[PDB]
Amino acid sequence: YFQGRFDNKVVVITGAGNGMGEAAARRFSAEGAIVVLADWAKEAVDKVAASLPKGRAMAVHIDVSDHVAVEKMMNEVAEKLGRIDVLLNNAGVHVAGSVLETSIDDWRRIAGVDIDGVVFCSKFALPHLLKTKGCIVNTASQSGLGGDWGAAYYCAAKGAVVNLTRAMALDHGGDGVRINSVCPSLVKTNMTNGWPQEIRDKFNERIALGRAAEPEEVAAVMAFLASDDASFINGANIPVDGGATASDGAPKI
Amino acid sequence: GRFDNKVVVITGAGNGMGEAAARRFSAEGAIVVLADWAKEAVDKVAASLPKGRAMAVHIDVSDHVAVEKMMNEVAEKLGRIDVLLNNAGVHVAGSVLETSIDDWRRIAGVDIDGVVFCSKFALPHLLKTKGCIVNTASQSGLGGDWGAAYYCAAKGAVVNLTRAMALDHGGDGVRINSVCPSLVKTNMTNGWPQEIRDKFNERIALGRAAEPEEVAAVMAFLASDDASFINGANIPVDGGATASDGAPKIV
Amino acid sequence: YFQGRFDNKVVVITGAGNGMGEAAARRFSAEGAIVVLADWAKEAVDKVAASLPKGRAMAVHIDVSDHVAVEKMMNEVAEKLGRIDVLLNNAGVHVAGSVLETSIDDWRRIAGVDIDGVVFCSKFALPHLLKTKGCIVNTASQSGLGGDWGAAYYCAAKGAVVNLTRAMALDHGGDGVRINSVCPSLVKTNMTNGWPQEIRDKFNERIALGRAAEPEEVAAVMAFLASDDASFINGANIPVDGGATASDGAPKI
Amino acid sequence: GRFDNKVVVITGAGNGMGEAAARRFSAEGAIVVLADWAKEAVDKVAASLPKGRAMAVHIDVSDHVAVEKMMNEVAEKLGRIDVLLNNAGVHVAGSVLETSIDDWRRIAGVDIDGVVFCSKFALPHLLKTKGCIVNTASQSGLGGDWGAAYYCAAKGAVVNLTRAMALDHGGDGVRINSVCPSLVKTNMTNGWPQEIRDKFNERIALGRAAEPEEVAAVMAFLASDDASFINGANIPVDGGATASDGAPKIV
Ligand SMILES: NC(=O)c1ccc[n+]([C@@H]2O[C@H](COP(=O)([O-])OP(=O)(O)OC[C@H]3O[C@@H](n4cnc5c(N)ncnc54)[C@H](O)[C@@H]3O)[C@@H](O)[C@H]2O)c1
Ligand SMILES: NC(=O)c1ccc[n+]([C@@H]2O[C@H](COP(=O)([O-])OP(=O)(O)OC[C@H]3O[C@@H](n4cnc5c(N)ncnc54)[C@H](O)[C@@H]3O)[C@@H](O)[C@H]2O)c1
Ligand code: NA
Ligand code: NA
Ligand code: NA
Ligand code: NA
């Protein structure tokens, strides 16, 4: 019933090597998209691309924090494939700590990819997206919709992405480029599967669905936000969090 | 066939977004129960859908007695309830100083009590199917209007009831979410003047009122497996309206 | 430095017998206000009133859920004292449970005082407030800014108060009546001091300040919102919660 | 004497809301440190206040080296820091397609980095006094603008940094909050045309731009003992702007 939903659409995915990035690549690919799997590292995106239909997936190296590199990537993709239809700004760096536990370097690391990456990839994709009346889906976070204990820089950066999603949706929605985010809770990885049962129980107590988000469940929302069914959704920061942000913060008794 | 043999109960199904939801869910294989107090209108919609896959209920969802009976009779007759769309709603325009106690009672009865009652009496049945609720809230539940004070109170209640019930029941397999439209082309707004409708085109970044089908599309998505990790969300379907900080355009 | 801030202003306080109501009465009284202590029960408001300066405090019986009684109370107060300057809509009923654990009666009990009380007291005070360019402070709740586990009706009612505060502030702010709320976390009572250390520790873990709100701390915000210092604050739902609603819901690790 | 002998560090203190805060805190007995990159302006404000109770620092708060030195020198010289107002800010108008990488760097440097750096290097000193932070965010950090994309990203970062740092440090006795103004009568907006300013009067329910003193009043309140249980709050000082759901007036 979703067969062909993204037939011959060009989807650029940044952070394509991470768990949400791979799940996105596979979901959009299954619905007919041509995927561009953009990431810093080579092995993960190459492996995913080689698993997808011949001629329908390509991998690129990018540092999304480098505006010159990003401009050149977006123009080459549009040149090589004739079009860009969807940008998934899914690159992400996290560092744990308060501002007293994290360095200027930690700030530059988080800000460069999590903020600058969204600004640069959106600014340089937009001329292509305007031609196709395509869209942008930002990977924001639960951590951009309110604060965390012990991730101050990360919360600042994801806060920037949530409000930039709003501002850009106002600037470009009326010219036919819808701009939205997904705000996932912590996604099931092995950088989460590796946590002790004490720690994974504390996360699950706070989520009414009582488990972590699967990456496929976040990908499903990204695909929906890029679909014609989302024609009137613009500037939205969609919580994909099992209820996490629906709480006023009071404990579950 | 996304909703093949799923029983979908839709309040306010005789017109507008409820009708559009009936047609969308019915197209995807649902059996639709169409609840409305507009008897002629909801009968016509039910009769337009595939034989044996649509039934109309003449009901005022403000009436807990009538709501409890409907949800139990539907469950008995069709053996299940999978989806509840709490969509039925009325609007009145004005500040509290320009709208009566009776106006308040009508707004609260349909827009707050209808949602509470329908949720409360559908829930035992949705728990059996790991079904879901989609509330029709509004942009006017996420923030205030000039000149719809009672409506804003009601839709405000719907937005936060969505969150609380999502925490209560999500763990037992019942997702509860809302859609929050801005202006939609329906009977609710077809009497509003061009002066006000034109300013909605300025305040909505997409530059137009929504079609009722564009909101039905999101109701279908929220009831779908692709929304399996969306719970307690008040989804704006507003073209950007609530994304604005309230400021006019800076340039 | 606050001496005289509310000199000869008439402050109507509903739920004047509860802990926030008494703390409000005392705070506004100390700054020169004439207080009207409106509540269902007699003993508490009589005791507070008798503790305050002669001629500067009166107690009334009211059911804020009764629109006829409320209209008559507001007109008699304005008639007797010549003016109303401030309305504190501080009446409150709570019942614990999901919608499956709470009855239609429980819904009518919560809705009548927590919603209807704010609508009725605001509608009937407003003609008086317009004459003095006074204001309204609603006692909303943390529970009106997001959901709780096990208080579904309460969250619906406080949600209504938070958004009604917004709508009314838009309707009346420009005519000189500012309308705001306070959104307290659970306030220290003996209906909280009576809870076991297991249960009070769970509440405190979720509040960065690591303790419950004192009623005086909520009263201080109500007085600020009614002051000339709050001249540009309108339609605001002020969290008085030690950080509770600043959290995205993630656990503290 | 609410701030008698309290050391209050105020960035952007040479003009507008920072200047108004300097005068308000100084009136209530504070010793004010006035940090600004506009040397003439901040010197004039400092010289206008009581002798021995005001000092100007010529600084670009985007520069972490300069910020760390200032906070340590202030603490050494005056023996304490009680309050930090992260107020310094710049604005640029346009979408990302109409504003340059350099524009972004200038906005991010002052509006995001300045706040991060000033907070980070003031904090050890505020922990000693159980002091507080008040950030100047904006209505444009709580929602989006048409035509201020970079500014909205920056103020968005400030709003959520306020929340995270409030959770990190509130327990150690350091409250962190923000004020979120709509239009204020300052150098920042004195170049904006009447067409845009008049529409702010429509979108602000109070019907006027704020005086800078009306925001300084709230900064003083948030640094006061009366705000002892307010933490991680982004307080709108906007006359109702963000209370709106985005809709134009219904009647
Ligand atoms: N149209 C908009 O601009 C807009 C915007 C946001 C939200 N909404 C919400 O959308 C929902 C649907 O409204 P619509 O715009 O499609 O208008 P509509 O008038 O086309 O349809 C509403 C339907 O609800 C029915 N209904 C009303 N009260 C009822 C009751 N007591 N019992 C049973 N049925 C009842 C009506 O008869 C009607 O068929 C409402 O909850 C409304 O508040 C409307
Ligand atoms: N004026 C408004 O409408 C409005 C609305 C909401 C928020 N704000 C915020 O209010 C704050 C104060 O701005 P204002 O309106 O009073 O404008 P202003 O121009 O009157 O004052 C801002 C001051 O900050 C100083 N400053 C700027 N960059 C600096 C830097 N790198 N280092 C040190 N000092 C620096 C400037 O020299 C100036 O003195 C800003 O953060 C602004 O974003 C303004
Ligand atoms: Na998760
Ligand atoms: Na109509
Ligand atoms: Na508390
Ligand atoms: Na200027």
Side-chain angles (χ1 to χ4, degrees), chain A residues 1-190 192-197 199-253, chain B, chain C residues 1-190 192-197 199-253, chain D:
Chain A
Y1 163 89
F2 295 121
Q3 162 155 359
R5 194 157 61 148
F6 293 101
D7 259 1
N8 296 324
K9 304 285 205 171
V10 173
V11 182
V12 177
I13 309 189
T14 71
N18 73 38
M20 278 178 302
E22 171 173 5
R26 296 194 179 286
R27 177 64 189 254
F28 278 92
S29 186
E31 297 187 10
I34 304 292
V35 180
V36 176
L37 295 85
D39 214 334
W40 176 273
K42 171 176 183 65
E43 279 172 56
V45 290
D46 278 357
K47 183 182 281 146
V48 176
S51 79
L52 300 177
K54 232 189 331 208
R56 300 195 81 65
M58 87 184 260
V60 294
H61 165 73
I62 189 75
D63 179 0
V64 291
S65 85
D66 177 345
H67 70 93
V68 179
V70 167
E71 179 172 19
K72 162 175 204 302
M73 174 182 74
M74 296 301 188
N75 291 341
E76 285 169 357
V77 170
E79 183 58 34
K80 178 186 171 185
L81 304 182
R83 69 193 288 113
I84 304 167
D85 293 285
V86 180
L87 171 59
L88 310 181
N89 279 308
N90 180 74
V93 178
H94 179 277
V95 178
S98 70
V99 303
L100 295 183
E101 289 169 326
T102 48
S103 53
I104 305 317
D105 184 64
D106 292 327
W107 168 245
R108 303 267 43 123
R109 286 179 60 201
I110 274 160
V113 171
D114 297 348
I115 316 172
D116 291 359
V118 178
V119 172
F120 298 162
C121 290
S122 301
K123 177 173 171 62
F124 295 122
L126 259 164
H128 306 303
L129 293 168
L130 284 163
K131 287 187 182 84
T132 58
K133 297 189 146 42
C135 76
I136 301 176
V137 188
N138 296 325
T139 305
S141 179
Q142 167 179 190
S143 303
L145 292 176
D148 292 319
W149 288 264
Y153 296 160
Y154 186 69
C155 287
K158 289 300 185 178
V161 177
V162 157
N163 212 45
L164 181 62
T165 297
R166 295 180 187 125
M168 293 197 67
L170 297 179
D171 290 330
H172 309 296
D175 296 317
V177 177
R178 289 184 306 100
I179 299 171
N180 297 289
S181 90
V182 294
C183 284
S185 60
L186 190 62
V187 179
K188 192 161 176 186
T189 63
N190 300 309
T192 73
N193 285 350
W195 297 7
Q197 210 50 40
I199 284 203
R200 261 189 278 96
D201 284 9
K202 276 180 294 187
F203 282 88
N204 291 331
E205 171 176 16
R206 292 300 313 164
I207 298 172
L209 294 195
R211 64 170 176 84
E214 307 288 343
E216 288 73 13
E217 289 175 302
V218 183
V221 186
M222 302 174 158
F224 166 67
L225 284 170
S227 79
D228 292 346
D229 278 349
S231 57
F232 220 77
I233 299 175
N234 186 44
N237 293 119
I238 309 294
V240 185
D241 66 4
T245 55
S247 171
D248 65 9
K252 166 160 204 196
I253 307 308
Chain B
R2 267 203 303 193
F3 293 101
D4 266 0
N5 304 323
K6 299 298 196 45
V7 169
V8 181
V9 179
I10 309 176
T11 75
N15 289 286
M17 284 176 269
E19 170 180 359
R23 298 191 184 284
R24 174 65 183 261
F25 276 93
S26 179
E28 302 196 13
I31 302 147
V32 182
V33 186
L34 298 75
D36 208 296
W37 70 352
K39 189 209 178 43
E40 191 175 4
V42 69
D43 284 349
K44 286 180 180 173
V45 180
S48 84
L49 295 177
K51 193 191 169 164
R53 282 221 287 113
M55 66 180 271
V57 179
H58 321 90
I59 184 167
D60 180 351
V61 294
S62 75
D63 172 353
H64 66 276
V65 178
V67 167
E68 181 172 21
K69 274 225 314 153
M70 175 178 77
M71 299 298 178
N72 290 339
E73 287 172 354
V74 162
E76 193 183 39
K77 182 180 173 194
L78 304 181
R80 66 189 299 118
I81 305 173
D82 292 284
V83 180
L84 173 59
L85 311 188
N86 287 308
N87 171 77
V90 294
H91 187 270
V92 72
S95 80
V96 300
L97 295 182
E98 298 301 346
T99 50
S100 69
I101 300 302
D102 286 343
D103 287 334
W104 168 239
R105 195 42 62 198
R106 187 155 194 278
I107 290 286
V110 180
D111 303 353
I112 316 174
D113 291 1
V115 179
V116 168
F117 298 157
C118 289
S119 303
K120 170 177 178 57
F121 298 116
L123 250 163
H125 305 302
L126 300 168
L127 279 162
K128 285 176 210 165
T129 60
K130 299 197 169 208
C132 71
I133 302 186
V134 183
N135 298 325
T136 311
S138 179
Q139 110 181 94
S140 309
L142 291 180
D145 295 314
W146 290 260
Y150 296 155
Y151 185 72
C152 289
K155 292 300 191 182
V158 175
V159 159
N160 212 45
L161 179 69
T162 297
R163 294 182 188 122
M165 295 196 61
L167 301 174
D168 287 334
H169 308 296
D172 299 318
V174 171
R175 288 179 317 95
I176 299 172
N177 298 286
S178 87
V179 289
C180 292
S182 187
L183 182 59
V184 189
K185 288 178 195 185
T186 77
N187 288 347
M188 187 168 282
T189 56
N190 69 4
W192 297 12
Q194 205 202 316
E195 187 221 338
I196 289 135
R197 289 192 61 139
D198 284 353
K199 285 172 172 281
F200 270 98
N201 295 339
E202 304 169 11
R203 297 298 314 166
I204 298 167
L206 297 184
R208 63 186 175 83
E211 309 300 333
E213 293 77 13
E214 296 180 280
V215 178
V218 186
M219 297 169 166
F221 169 69
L222 288 174
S224 88
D225 292 340
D226 279 349
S228 62
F229 213 72
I230 304 182
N231 184 47
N234 292 288
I235 306 296
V237 189
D238 68 359
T242 60
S244 176
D245 57 16
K249 301 195 189 180
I250 301 307
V251 289
Chain C
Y1 163 89
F2 295 121
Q3 162 155 359
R5 194 157 61 148
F6 293 101
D7 259 1
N8 296 324
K9 304 285 205 171
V10 173
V11 182
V12 177
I13 309 189
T14 71
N18 73 38
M20 278 178 302
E22 171 173 5
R26 296 194 179 286
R27 177 64 189 254
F28 278 92
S29 186
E31 297 187 10
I34 304 292
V35 180
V36 176
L37 295 85
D39 214 334
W40 176 273
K42 171 176 183 65
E43 279 172 56
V45 290
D46 278 357
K47 183 182 281 146
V48 176
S51 79
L52 300 177
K54 232 189 331 208
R56 300 195 81 65
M58 87 184 260
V60 294
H61 165 73
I62 189 75
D63 179 0
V64 291
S65 85
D66 177 345
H67 70 93
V68 179
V70 167
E71 179 172 19
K72 162 175 204 302
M73 174 182 74
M74 296 301 188
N75 291 341
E76 285 169 357
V77 170
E79 183 58 34
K80 178 186 171 185
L81 304 182
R83 69 193 288 113
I84 304 167
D85 293 285
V86 180
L87 171 59
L88 310 181
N89 279 308
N90 180 74
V93 178
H94 179 277
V95 178
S98 70
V99 303
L100 295 183
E101 289 169 326
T102 48
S103 53
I104 305 317
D105 184 64
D106 292 327
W107 168 245
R108 303 267 43 123
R109 286 179 60 201
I110 274 160
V113 171
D114 297 348
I115 316 172
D116 291 359
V118 178
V119 172
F120 298 162
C121 290
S122 301
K123 177 173 171 62
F124 295 122
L126 259 164
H128 306 303
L129 293 168
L130 284 163
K131 287 187 182 84
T132 58
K133 297 189 146 42
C135 76
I136 301 176
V137 188
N138 296 325
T139 305
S141 179
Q142 167 179 190
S143 303
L145 292 176
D148 292 319
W149 288 264
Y153 296 160
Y154 186 69
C155 287
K158 289 300 185 178
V161 177
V162 157
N163 212 45
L164 181 62
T165 297
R166 295 180 187 125
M168 293 197 67
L170 297 179
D171 290 330
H172 309 296
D175 296 317
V177 177
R178 289 184 306 100
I179 299 171
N180 297 289
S181 90
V182 294
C183 284
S185 60
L186 190 62
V187 179
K188 192 161 176 186
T189 63
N190 300 309
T192 73
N193 285 350
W195 297 7
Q197 210 50 40
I199 284 203
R200 261 189 278 96
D201 284 9
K202 276 180 294 187
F203 282 88
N204 291 331
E205 171 176 16
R206 292 300 313 164
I207 298 172
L209 294 195
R211 64 170 176 84
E214 307 288 343
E216 288 73 13
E217 289 175 302
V218 183
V221 186
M222 302 174 158
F224 166 67
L225 284 170
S227 79
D228 292 346
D229 278 349
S231 57
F232 220 77
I233 299 175
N234 186 44
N237 293 119
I238 309 294
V240 185
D241 66 4
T245 55
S247 171
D248 65 9
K252 166 160 204 196
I253 307 308
Chain D
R2 267 203 303 193
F3 293 101
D4 266 0
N5 304 323
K6 299 298 196 45
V7 169
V8 181
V9 179
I10 309 176
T11 75
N15 289 286
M17 284 176 269
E19 170 180 359
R23 298 191 184 284
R24 174 65 183 261
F25 276 93
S26 179
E28 302 196 13
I31 302 147
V32 182
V33 186
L34 298 75
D36 208 296
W37 70 352
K39 189 209 178 43
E40 191 175 4
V42 69
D43 284 349
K44 286 180 180 173
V45 180
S48 84
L49 295 177
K51 193 191 169 164
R53 282 221 287 113
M55 66 180 271
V57 179
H58 321 90
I59 184 167
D60 180 351
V61 294
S62 75
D63 172 353
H64 66 276
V65 178
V67 167
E68 181 172 21
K69 274 225 314 153
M70 175 178 77
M71 299 298 178
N72 290 339
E73 287 172 354
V74 162
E76 193 183 39
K77 182 180 173 194
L78 304 181
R80 66 189 299 118
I81 305 173
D82 292 284
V83 180
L84 173 59
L85 311 188
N86 287 308
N87 171 77
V90 294
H91 187 270
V92 72
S95 80
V96 300
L97 295 182
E98 298 301 346
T99 50
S100 69
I101 300 302
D102 286 343
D103 287 334
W104 168 239
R105 195 42 62 198
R106 187 155 194 278
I107 290 286
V110 180
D111 303 353
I112 316 174
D113 291 1
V115 179
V116 168
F117 298 157
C118 289
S119 303
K120 170 177 178 57
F121 298 116
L123 250 163
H125 305 302
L126 300 168
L127 279 162
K128 285 176 210 165
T129 60
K130 299 197 169 208
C132 71
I133 302 186
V134 183
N135 298 325
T136 311
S138 179
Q139 110 181 94
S140 309
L142 291 180
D145 295 314
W146 290 260
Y150 296 155
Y151 185 72
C152 289
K155 292 300 191 182
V158 175
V159 159
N160 212 45
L161 179 69
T162 297
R163 294 182 188 122
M165 295 196 61
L167 301 174
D168 287 334
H169 308 296
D172 299 318
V174 171
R175 288 179 317 95
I176 299 172
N177 298 286
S178 87
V179 289
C180 292
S182 187
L183 182 59
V184 189
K185 288 178 195 185
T186 77
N187 288 347
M188 187 168 282
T189 56
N190 69 4
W192 297 12
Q194 205 202 316
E195 187 221 338
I196 289 135
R197 289 192 61 139
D198 284 353
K199 285 172 172 281
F200 270 98
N201 295 339
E202 304 169 11
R203 297 298 314 166
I204 298 167
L206 297 184
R208 63 186 175 83
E211 309 300 333
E213 293 77 13
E214 296 180 280
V215 178
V218 186
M219 297 169 166
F221 169 69
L222 288 174
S224 88
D225 292 340
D226 279 349
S228 62
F229 213 72
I230 304 182
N231 184 47
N234 292 288
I235 306 296
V237 189
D238 68 359
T242 60
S244 176
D245 57 16
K249 301 195 189 180
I250 301 307
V251 289

